[PDB]
């Protein structure tokens, strides 16, 4: 069921936080867990972070240095889906975090 772009709340052991799925959709259908990046209210100026926009699920930022694996069963409240413009910026941030080469 879960899709790339969707934000879910999840508690990893320090309170329930918003998480953006970045795993591809085939993985998400067949596997028991997904890969996600932390949404946060903290504000840091680093190219691995992206600011949400007005038609995004919430206020704050995506930190792509903080990738986590979350069980489907652990997925809490569905907070919406990011805009494709915001998802494009996130792609960049992710590629940067995982040192994908230039161009």
């Amino acid at each position: 069921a879960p899709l790339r772009g969707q934000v879910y709340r999840c508690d990893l052991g320090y309170g329930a936080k918003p998480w953006l799925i970045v795993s591809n959709n085939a993985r998400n259908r067949h596997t028991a867990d997904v890969v996600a990046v932390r949404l946060t209210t903290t504000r840091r100026t680093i190219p691995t972070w992206v600011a949400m926009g007005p038609s995004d699920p919430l206020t704050g930022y995506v930190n792509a240095d903080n990738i986590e694996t979350l069980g489907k069963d652990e997925l809490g409240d569905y907070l919406g889906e990011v805009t494709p413009a915001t998802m494009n910026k996130i792609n960049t941030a992710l590629a940067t975090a995982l040192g994908l080469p230039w161009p």
Partner: protein, 81 residues
């Protein structure tokens, strides 16, 4: 768009052209792009230093977040074992 080059710089542009670029234009384009990318990596470096100066557990918000993350990683290594 009208670029001016000293003697050794022109002589270097030719060295890099002879090394396998298509033309002078292509080489300068690429040198500009490589320089930009090099400055981008230099700023990513500095940004990680600043984030770590302000928070030594980055990218985790606290040392507790790290612990949790590592315990869950361990649990996953146990289950595959």
């Amino acid at each position: 768009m009208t670029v001016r080059l000293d003697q050794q710089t022109r002589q270097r542009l030719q060295d890099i052209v002879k090394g396998g670029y298509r033309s002078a234009n292509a080489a300068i384009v690429d040198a500009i792009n490589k320089r930009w990318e090099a400055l981008h990596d230099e700023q990513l470096d500095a940004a990680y230093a600043a984030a770590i100066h302000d928070n030594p557990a980055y990218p985790y918000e606290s040392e507790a977040e790290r612990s949790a993350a590592r315990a869950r990683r361990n649990a996953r290594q146990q289950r595959s074992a």
